[PDB]
Paper text:
Here, we used cryo-EM to determine a high-resolution structure of AtOSCA3.1, the first reported OSCA gene, in nanodiscs. The pore profile of these OSCAs is maintained and the small radii towards the extracellular side suggests these channels are in a closed/non-conductive state, as suggested by previous MD simulations. We identified multiple lipid-like densities in one of our postprocessed maps. Notably, one of these densities is located at the pore fenestration, at a position similar to that observed in previous MD simulations of OSCA1.2, supporting the proposed occupation of the pore pathway by lipids. Thus, our nanodisc structure represents a further ‘extended’ state than the one found both in digitonin and LMNG micelles.
The dimeric two-pore OSCA/TMEM63 family has recently been identified as mechanically activated ion channels. In our previous work, we identified OSCA/TMEM63 as a conserved family of MA ion channels spanning several eukaryotic clades and having considerable diversity in the plant kingdom, where species commonly have more than one paralog. A hydrophobic gate on the extracellular half of the pore blocks ion flow.
Author numbering:
A (entry chain A), B (entry chain B): 2 to 102, 154 to 231, 234 to 246, 280 to 303, 307 to 388, 410 to 476, 489 to 697
The structure:
């Protein structure tokens, strides 16, 4: 509805401006530096480089704009730079589309053109990032799972040392058996004059729990190699003729290793995957109810705000559930669990929000002709939703009002020591688990309606363009990376953008059909092209993202690695 | 039709008996030993062990029956033994089915039970065969493709030696660049008093062609390692970040290497695959015409013989085309090209013969009720077809009348030397390229009609049971293996038997539906079970067939390998 649409844009716009003014004002106050420039503070940099102490209100835009991809990588990592490739690839595609705005072929060609070049670019970026990388513990290690039980008279450790030494008698350093939840919990309590008495009791509990952990057969271990080349090859090889025994993959970064899942055996992993995938499919079906609510609501005070707020509230609970469920499948690493969570989220983005909202909306208003006319009207909801996210969402992301309020309240009433005050402002990472899925939803909708309800394209341009600028500022000044996946996220993104294009092509095949267009058939070739394109891109670039190439593993060492430090890096609670 | 059915069984039966009597008579004559016992002759064994020179006419049955799988492997190879696993797995499944003959669940459970145990058995058989294997050239080598062109000033060989030495500086022995069709053709002519003058001219042509070959950049090479472990690992690893450069796989057995395809670049391979797969799909569509002919024909003199003869004639031309097309895709090895040919054949077995004959037959005679009643009648054609193959087909396979006639005519009129006489009787191999696809067709039909037209099950039992006995005799006395794939064929077979079961379950879901059975829905769980079963079997056993496990590669050597002989083994035309 038009009136409600303008009201929502108006409210989101004004809130955006207010937040922009609070940002301009508050970000120039030194007392808020822990909130507005924590990445620079943690890295030992001045909050800003002007030095005059009279910062121009638009200085941040100039700084964000005159910053190259290389500066983003040098300061915040490859994954961070890849996130910007994603945002600009999309912006380039939509801007090209709007220059023209039949258009289906234009968009598909532009999309294929940019995905081809973007995948090529990231593959190059990643290769260079790996090429200059320093010595890290995960470069020398593999994760071994599904070990069989040892024979009587031998323990689990001895058994694994024996197995690997026979295969790799020279290039074998250590095996750390993945043994202890009670100990971890009690130890945490111990780490945390009645308080002193409580601490003593907690320490005693930790000792008891540690004894139980010592008593505990295990089925997994982390194995270390003396060289990058050997580890790279070991992780790629079959160790037993029995596929289900002693299975080997590359070890996750120490910061990413999900220790609690390492002793889940292959078949238990298979069972968990089927029950979890099943559970998720069931969850998707229950989410049809919250979606029906959002679509049914779409007087002004509710239409302009409630459909969007409710959709945000229900979807906001998914990342927590989905990441939990992914960890529960037996996944060994945090970045994989995150990609998996994003994968599950995507299925909600497609079946509950794009399809769900669109269909439910269509069903509330010559049947085929009616449906064809009704479909484009759902775009107004989506234009509002997208604007809400780029005006208020980015308004809050840039102004950091919520973190600022919480921080000052903790500093004044709860924090007693300097350490507590610093914990209160630690910025966290970019939350790829919620951020990428968010952007993927915007793309799904913008692509799907790009030639049905074309104004959405401008909103898509602003969302991605403004996001580029807002997040470029946050990437440089606020967030701190928690793990480095080296662009391993890109193939996830590539496949989902291409999937969105695929869905678009399928939708236009059907929509042109709804309008009974004689030549809908000409889009079948695009549907086929998308599948072939995907296949070819996978054949040309994909494997380069799963493994470090031996030509990279074989790089000249700056110095010999200390394998003992490498080993220590993987021992929790010590 | 019943009369024609009995006539075909009668004729096939009598021909079978005549061929069995000719076999009994002729196989006891010493002059035919080169035809009836060539495997034993080539191996230096007496044609038969009785020594009395008075062989019992049924002695061959006793010998074929009291022969274990181990004796088949020891004499004729693993692939040969696997072929027998295939035949007996199927026999066990059908015999169990006939004990009961709702039945859909019985059959599916028996089938899952036997496939599980058969896959387990073969995996064990294969592992043992690899475990006791001797030193062979393919155990120490990889095939490298899609090499980039060298920089100016360096040649292709130098460029590959440089690339691999940097990655594997110690475990690197040789690189044989895959350089020469004109030379091969002219050399063959040279190898083959006007005849002396012709030979001299052919030798001159060979020299000229050799010079042209010497002049010839290349994109592939065979690389040798100093150890089984290193080769096994190299073949499993990524060498470049650019996926399409320097791609590496395990080298094919020297006897299997399809040299003409090694210089086809990745993207040309991708193009060839799409055009070839396309061509094959088109061929499948043109084959619908020969099928329509066969079904339309199905007075007595034609009904009893022509539908079957024509079907045999048209299908008989496929193995030649399909193997050619597979080689044309850029496949590096003969056993892979054969599996690929069998794969393509399977699609004809499914779309041109099972579906094609069944559908066309149904269309030549309350629509759903009519179709349900009509479908089972096609089984009579198939019972005839199967009996034709086990009575006349096996009759000829055992009696070897055609090879015998040709052999004696060559020996008497064309062969002048002893060498020519021996060439005339060389038995060849088991022709897995035509033999496995043949048996797969019988299974597709027997499974699909096992509860629709149940008598087919008895014919299926006889086909596989009698084939076991007839081919057990041929496996021990007649055929000579041309390559050894070590059971690599089994996953092809497993997946196709399971695919046949899957098709059966889909067909019964539909057929029970055709009879408007209330509980057709209960078969959906079997369809799902089949897919999960496949997935689980793949996860548990499959990888063990793609690579030799490092625990096997690491077996103690009897003696150090001669790497130079290993290298020579891969050089054609020298
Ligand atoms: C009828 C339609 C009329 C015309 C079309 C409509 C809208 C166009 C919108 C944006 C410009 C297109 C950029 C394509 C880049 C693809 C390749 C790549 O990846 O670019 C990247 C990223 O550049 C970008 O996007 C920058 C985006 C800037 C933020 C604001 C954007 C607009 C949002 C507000 C509302 C819309 C106003 C539109 C006015 C025309 C280059 O790399 P970098 O990060 O190393 O350098 C970064 C820059 N240095 C070289 C100077 C260091
Ligand atoms: C209402 C229905 C009535 C009853 C059911 C109907 C028909 C039953 C047909 C055949 C027997 C079942 C064999 C299952 C084996 C599965 C596991 C395995 O793999 O077995 C294999 C292979 O054994 C076989 O099949 C042998 C087949 C023999 C050739 C003739 C078969 C019948 C064809 C003629 C017409 C039908 C007459 C039927 C009369 C009842 C065992 O291993 P091997 O090769 O090391 O030893 C080989 C044998 N040594 C241990 C002594 C060395
Ligand atoms: C009467 C009935 C009316 C129905 C009306 C609603 C119809 C729409 C519902 C659609 C349900 C979709 C369920 C399938 C997605 C859930 C499973 C799953 O999540 O598993 C897949 C892996 O693809 C995950 O792979 P992932 O771990 O992400 O890999 C990342 C790195 N490679
Ligand atoms: C108006 C129209 C009426 C139509 C009526 C007829 C309908 C039935 C026609 C069906 C056409 C089927 C075509 C697809 C098979 C051909 C491709 C192909 O061959 O490629 C696949 C890889 O699966 C091969 O894999 P492979 O090399 O065997 O691997 C072995 C070891 N892993
Ligand atoms: C769609 C764009 C809307 C405008 C949003 C940005 C508003 C920021 C305006 C900042 C102006 C601050 C001027 C203060 C000058 C001073 O330091 O005295
Ligand atoms: C529309 C405004 C709502 C949000 C409230 C804004 C008022 C400031 C809240 C943060 C308290 C810290 C103020 C700056 C302290 C300093 O001067 O260093
Ligand atoms: C219906 C048929 C459509 C076919 C369209 C396929 C278009 C090819 C895909 C884009 C490739 C872009 C290549 C860029 C090369 C480069 O700059 O490195
Ligand atoms: C169907 C038309 C296809 C051609 C579109 C031309 C778009 C303008 C040229 C852009 C060149 C820059 C490439 C950037 C690749 C990237 O980093 O994503
Ligand atoms: C909600 C439906 C759940 C479906 C669950 C399917 C899980 C299949 C698990 C197969 C386990 C195979 C065990 C093999 C053990 C062995 O033989 O070594
Ligand atoms: C209620 C419907 C639920 C349907 C869920 C289907 C889940 C299929 C899972 C098997 C597909 C292959 C995934 C492989 C993942 C891995 O490599 O571990
Ligand atoms: C919740 C139970 C799952 C219900 C849906 C069935 C899912 C079947 C998954 C089969 C995956 C097959 C992937 C491997 C391909 C192969 O067999 O070669
Ligand atoms: C004037 C009436 C105001 C009523 C609500 C104000 C506008 C709604 C903003 C609340 C939700 C904002 C959440 C957006 C950030 C996000 O995407 O999570
Ligand atoms: C009609 C089109 C439907 C569109 C939704 C497609 C959902 C699937 C998303 C892409 C899955 C990609 C699978 C490859 C493995 C991987 O995820 O890395
Ligand atoms: C509808 C059937 C035909 C469709 C065939 C589509 C094949 C296009 C796949 C993408 C390849 C792009 C290669 C670009 C390389 C270059 O020119 O630089
Ligand atoms: C379905 C089975 C039909 C029978 C087919 C097998 C017939 C073979 C009979 C051979 C008997 C030969 C007796 C000769 C005795 C002798 O040496 O004098
Ligand atoms: C129905 C018979 C048709 C086939 C012709 C069978 C007659 C024998 C043909 C083969 C010739 C060799 C005969 C055996 C020579 C020998 O005694 O060593
Ligand atoms: C509709 C649900 C049907 C489910 C049926 C699944 C039956 C399990 C598959 C057969 C497993 C046989 C295990 C044999 C174990 C052994 O002897 O080693
Ligand atoms: C649904 C019923 C399942 C049980 C069927 C029982 C069949 C009899 C037992 C056969 C044991 C021999 C296994 C041989 C496995 C093989 O080599 O293929
Ligand atoms: C009958 C239809 C045939 C369809 C043929 C599709 C073949 C697609 C081939 C893609 C080639 C990609 C070339 C990439 C070269 C490069 O950029 O390095
Ligand atoms: C006329 C219709 C023809 C349809 C042919 C479809 C061919 C699809 C080929 C791509 C599927 C993946 C095969 C991978 C084989 C490989 O690993 O080299
Ligand atoms: C003859 C032209 C082919 C026409 C039919 C289209 C075949 C598309 C094949 C796509 C294979 C995709 C396999 C890789 C899966 C992925 O993209 O992750
Ligand atoms: C009495 C009339 C005889 C007419 C034809 C005789 C029976 C037909 C046999 C000829 C075809 C035999 C081919 C079967 C072997 C095969 O499967 O290739
Ligand atoms: C409705 C069921 C149709 C039955 C025909 C199925 C045709 C596909 C045959 C099996 C393909 C297996 C693919 C896995 C890769 C491989 O072949 O090794
Ligand atoms: C219809 C949904 C449920 C179907 C689930 C089917 C799972 C069966 C997969 C085969 C596993 C057989 C494991 C046998 C191991 C053993 O007991 O020895």
């Amino acid at each position: 509805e038009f009136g409600s649409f303008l009201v929502s844009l108006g409210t989101s716009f004004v809130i955006f401006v207010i937040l922009m003014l609070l940002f301009t004002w508050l970000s120039r106050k030194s007392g808020n530096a822990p909130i507005y420039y924590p990445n620079r503070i943690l890295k030992g940099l001045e909050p800003w480089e002007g030095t005059s102490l009279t910062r121009n209100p638009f200085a941040w835009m100039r700084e964000a704009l005159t910053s190259s991809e290389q500066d983003v990588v040098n300061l915040s990592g490859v994954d961070t730079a890849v996130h910007f490739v994603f945002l600009s690839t999309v912006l380039g595609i939509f801007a090209c589309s709007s220059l023209l705005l039949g258009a289906v072929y234009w968009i598909s060609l532009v999309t294929y053109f940019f995905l081809w070049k973007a995948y090529k670019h990231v593959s190059s970026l990643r290769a260079q990032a790996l090429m200059s990388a320093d010595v890290k513990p995960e470069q020398f290690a593999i994760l071994v799972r599904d070990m069989p039980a040892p024979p009587d008279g031998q323990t689990q450790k001895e058994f694994i040392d024996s197995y690997f030494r026979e295969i790799y008698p020279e290039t074998f350093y250590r095996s750390l058996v993945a043994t202890x939840x009670x100990x971890x919990x009690x130890x945490x309590x111990x780490x945390x004059x009645x308080x002193x008495x409580x601490x003593x009791x907690x320490x005693x509990x930790x000792x008891x729990x540690x004894x139980x952990x010592x008593x505990x057969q295990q089925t997994a271990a982390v194995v270390f190699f003396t060289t990058r080349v050997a580890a790279a090859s070991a992780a790629q090889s079959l160790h037993c003729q029995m596929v289900d025994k002693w299975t080997v993959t590359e070890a996750p970064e120490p910061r990413q290793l999900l220790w609690q899942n390492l002793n889940i055996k292959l078949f238990s992993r298979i069972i968990r995957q089927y029950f979890i995938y099943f559970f998720v499919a069931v969850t998707i079906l229950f989410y049809m109810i919250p979606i029906a609510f959002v679509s049914a609501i779409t007087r002004t005070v509710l239409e302009s705000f409630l459909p969007q707020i409710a959709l945000i509230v229900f979807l906001a609970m998914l990342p927590k559930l989905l990441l939990f469920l992914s960890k529960a499948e037996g996944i060994p690493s945090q970045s994989h669990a995150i990609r998996a969570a994003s994968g599950k989220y995507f299925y909600f983005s497609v079946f509950n929000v794009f399809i769900g909202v669109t269909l439910a909306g269509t069903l509330f208003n010559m049947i085929i002709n009616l449906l064809a006319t009704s479909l484009p009207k759902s775009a107004t909801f989506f234009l509002t939703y997208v604007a809400l996210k780029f005006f208020i969402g980015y308004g809050l992301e840039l102004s950091r009002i919520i973190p600022l309020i919480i921080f000052h309240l903790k500093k004044k009433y709860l924090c007693k020591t300097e350490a507590e005050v610093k914990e209160a402002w630690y910025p966290g990472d970019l939350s790829y688990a919620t951020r990428v899925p968010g952007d993927m939803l915007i793309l799904t909708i913008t692509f799907c309606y790009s030639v049905i309800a074309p104004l959405i394209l401008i909103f898509g341009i602003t969302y991605f363009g403004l996001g580029w600028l807002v997040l470029r500022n946050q990437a440089l000044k606020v967030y701190v990376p928690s793990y480095e996946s080296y662009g391993r996220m890109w193939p996830h993104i590539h496949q989902r953008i291409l999937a969105a294009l695929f869905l678009f092509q399928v939708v236009m095949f059907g929509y042109l059909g709804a309008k009974t267009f004689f030549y809908t058939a000409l889009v079948i070739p695009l549907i086929i092209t998308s599948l072939i394109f995907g296949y070819v891109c996978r054949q040309k670039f994909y494997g380069g993202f799963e493994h470090t190439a031996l030509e990279v593993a074989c790089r000249e060492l700056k110095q010999s690695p200390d394998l003992e430090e490498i080993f220590r890096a993987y021992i929790p609670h010590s």
